[PDB]
Design an enzyme around this catalytic site. Structure first.
Site, PDB file in Angstrom:
ATOM      1  N   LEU A   1      -7.062  -4.725  -1.786  1.00  0.00           N
ATOM      2  CA  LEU A   1      -7.150  -5.723  -2.839  1.00  0.00           C
ATOM      3  C   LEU A   1      -5.845  -6.476  -3.025  1.00  0.00           C
ATOM      4  O   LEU A   1      -5.852  -7.632  -3.405  1.00  0.00           O
ATOM      5  CB  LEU A   1      -7.466  -5.049  -4.186  1.00  0.00           C
ATOM      6  CG  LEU A   1      -8.780  -4.309  -4.408  1.00  0.00           C
ATOM      7  CD1 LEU A   1      -8.741  -3.619  -5.763  1.00  0.00           C
ATOM      8  CD2 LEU A   1      -9.949  -5.283  -4.339  1.00  0.00           C
ATOM      9  N   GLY A   2      -4.725  -5.788  -2.795  1.00  0.00           N
ATOM     10  CA  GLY A   2      -3.396  -6.373  -2.940  1.00  0.00           C
ATOM     11  C   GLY A   2      -2.347  -5.491  -2.297  1.00  0.00           C
ATOM     12  O   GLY A   2      -2.652  -4.393  -1.840  1.00  0.00           O
TER      13      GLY A   2
ATOM     14  N   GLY B   1       2.384  -4.838  -2.035  1.00  0.00           N
ATOM     15  CA  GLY B   1       3.727  -5.041  -2.587  1.00  0.00           C
ATOM     16  C   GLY B   1       4.686  -4.119  -1.875  1.00  0.00           C
ATOM     17  O   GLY B   1       4.305  -3.500  -0.885  1.00  0.00           O
ATOM     18  N   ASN B   2       5.915  -4.015  -2.381  1.00  0.00           N
ATOM     19  CA  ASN B   2       6.935  -3.174  -1.762  1.00  0.00           C
ATOM     20  C   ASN B   2       6.507  -1.725  -1.690  1.00  0.00           C
ATOM     21  O   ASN B   2       6.885  -1.010  -0.775  1.00  0.00           O
ATOM     22  CB  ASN B   2       8.256  -3.241  -2.531  1.00  0.00           C
ATOM     23  CG  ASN B   2       9.362  -2.439  -1.858  1.00  0.00           C
ATOM     24  OD1 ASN B   2       9.803  -2.774  -0.751  1.00  0.00           O
ATOM     25  ND2 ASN B   2       9.811  -1.372  -2.516  1.00  0.00           N
TER      26      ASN B   2
ATOM     27  N   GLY C   1       3.445  -0.556  -1.261  1.00  0.00           N
ATOM     28  CA  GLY C   1       2.341  -0.311  -0.333  1.00  0.00           C
ATOM     29  C   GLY C   1       1.144  -1.182  -0.659  1.00  0.00           C
ATOM     30  O   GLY C   1       1.274  -2.406  -0.732  1.00  0.00           O
TER      31      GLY C   1
ATOM     32  N   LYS D   1      -3.583   2.814  -6.151  1.00  0.00           N
ATOM     33  CA  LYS D   1      -2.266   2.381  -5.678  1.00  0.00           C
ATOM     34  C   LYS D   1      -1.811   3.456  -4.701  1.00  0.00           C
ATOM     35  O   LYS D   1      -1.721   4.624  -5.080  1.00  0.00           O
ATOM     36  CB  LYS D   1      -1.311   2.206  -6.870  1.00  0.00           C
ATOM     37  CG  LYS D   1       0.101   1.736  -6.531  1.00  0.00           C
ATOM     38  CD  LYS D   1       0.877   1.457  -7.804  1.00  0.00           C
ATOM     39  CE  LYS D   1       2.347   1.141  -7.564  1.00  0.00           C
ATOM     40  NZ  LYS D   1       3.037   0.832  -8.856  1.00  0.00           N
TER      41      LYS D   1
ATOM     42  N   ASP E   1       7.080  -5.288 -19.162  1.00  0.00           N
ATOM     43  CA  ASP E   1       6.597  -6.195 -18.150  1.00  0.00           C
ATOM     44  C   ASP E   1       5.279  -6.819 -18.587  1.00  0.00           C
ATOM     45  O   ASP E   1       4.339  -6.981 -17.792  1.00  0.00           O
ATOM     46  CB  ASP E   1       6.448  -5.431 -16.840  1.00  0.00           C
ATOM     47  CG  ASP E   1       6.434  -6.349 -15.598  1.00  0.00           C
ATOM     48  OD1 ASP E   1       6.816  -7.516 -15.688  1.00  0.00           O
ATOM     49  OD2 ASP E   1       5.998  -5.878 -14.560  1.00  0.00           O
TER      50      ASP E   1
END
Ligand SMILES: CCN(c1nc(Nc2ccc3c(c2)S(=O)(=O)NC3)ncc1Cl)c1cccc2[nH]ncc12
EC number: 2.7.10.2
Length: 267
Positions: free
Chosen positions: A15-16, A18-19, A21, A40, A132
């Site tokens: 699905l997505g 990043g750094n 994984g 994740k 965040d």
């Protein structure tokens, strides 16, 4: 007690990323019903002890949270890699959604931002700082149900303090005391919530566009603020400006923010 990898089934497509994984959709077998999950998964079979610790810190925060407007954690799974298993919010990030659906009514936006404010009121009561809070970290369960996500930078405040003293630095969502004194409080999250509100009424457009962080800080210190988005009710823009109260002492907490959104939404 950790999750059983045998009871987790993952989809192939990610699905997505990043750094850390990747994020994949999967299914977890509960006592009878099967539950759709967002997972994740750490890169290079969790080689880096930094990524490993950060995943474990995030899970430690999620275990303590229980609210209808905060993504629930199913658990951690140590398998071929380290995995953090969350309830799936099917429609994904609020910003991307609104970028694809500009017909969404102002009343529907108020609904969703109010839900966010309820979750934040809970988080403030629970003495956690999100750190965040932004439109990309709000996930949609339905077009009418938002949940707060990504507690990667979040901190549980100590029993004797009202703030946390601090790589990733989302300056455009940060209050002046975070930038000038490195102090993070629920009042700081209130400032970020103001920016999130602007993002939502701007249909997921980026805040302070074309500006470097240093340029934003300078703008704010001059008393200047982003303008009212096209079609945003004035009452909501006024609440944004209240969230962007420079002096933290005089800035509202989430009880007052949620109450204003509640009263505008229902009355
Ligand atoms: C945003 C990714 N995410 C979740 N994602 C989703 N659903 C979702 C649906 C569509 C899309 C995405 C995610 S995407 O942004 O990766 N690509 C489109 N639901 C719940 C969570 Cl918690 C997460 C899953 C597990 C741990 C996490 N920590 N921080 C966030 C997070």
């Amino acid at each position: 007690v950790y999750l059983d990898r045998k009871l987790l089934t993952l989809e192939d497509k990610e699905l997505g990323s990043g750094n850390f994984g990747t994020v994949k959709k999967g299914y977890y077998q509960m006592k009878k019903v099967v539950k759709t999950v967002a997972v994740k998964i750490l890169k290079n079979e969790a080689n880096d002890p930094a990524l490993k610790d950060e995943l474990l810190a995030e899970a430690n925060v999620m275990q303590q949270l229980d609210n209808p407007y905060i993504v629930r954690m199913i658990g951690i799974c140590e398998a071929e890699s380290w995995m953090l298993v969350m309830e799936m919010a099917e429609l994904g990030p609020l910003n991307k959604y609104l970028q694809q659906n500009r017909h969404v009514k102002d009343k529907n936006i108020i609904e969703l931002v109010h839900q966010v404010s309820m979750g934040m009121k809970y988080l403030e009561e629970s003495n956690f700082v999100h750190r965040d809070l932004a439109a990309r970290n709000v996930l949609l369960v339905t077009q009418h149900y938002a949940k707060i996500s990504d507690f990667g930078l979040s901190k549980a405040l100590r029993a004797d303090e009202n703030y946390y003293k601090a790589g990733k630095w989302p300056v455009k969502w940060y209050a002046p005391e975070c930038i000038n004194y490195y102090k993070f409080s629920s009042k700081s999250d209130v400032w970020s919530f103001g920016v999130l509100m602007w993002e939502a009424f701007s249909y997921g457009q980026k805040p302070y566009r074309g500006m470097k962080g240093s340029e934003v800080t300078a703008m704010l210190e001059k008393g200047e603020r982003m303008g009212c988005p096209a079609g945003c009710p004035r009452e909501m823009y006024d609440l944004m400006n209240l969230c962007w109260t420079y002096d933290v002492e005089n800035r509202p907490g989430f009880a007052a923010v949620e109450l204003r959104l509640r009263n505008y939404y229902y009355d």
